[PDB]
């Protein structure tokens, strides 16, 4: 099958996926 969902760099925000950009990673707060 195909896959797209996953975890971003170390400590990156989940919702920053699949973009996983550094800036978005630096901050993480699902609220």
CA distance 9 to 16: 10
The DSSP element (H or E) to which 10 belongs, if any, is none
Angle at 18 between CA 25 and CA 14, to 5 degrees: 50
Q: How many CB atoms lie within 10 A of CB 8?
A: 19
Q: How was this structure determined?
A: NMR
With beta carbons less than 8 A apart as the criterion, state whether 18 and 7 touch. Answer: no
The torsion defined by the Cα of 1, 5, 8 and 15, in degrees rounded to 10, comes to 180
Q: Evaluate whether 29 touches 15 at the Cβ level (below 8 Å).
A: no
Structural domain boundaries in the chain:
1-31
3-class secondary structure, 24: helix
Q: Are the C-beta atoms of residues 12 and 23 closer than 8 Å to each other?
A: no
Cβ contacts of residue 27 below 8 Å, gap of 6+? 13
List CB contacts of 15: < 8 A, sequence separation 6 or more: 30
């Amino acid at each position: 099958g195909s896959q797209i969902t996953g975890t971003c760099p170390s400590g990156c925000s989940g919702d920053c996926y699949p973009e996983c950009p550094p800036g978005c990673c630096g901050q993480v707060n699902l609220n």
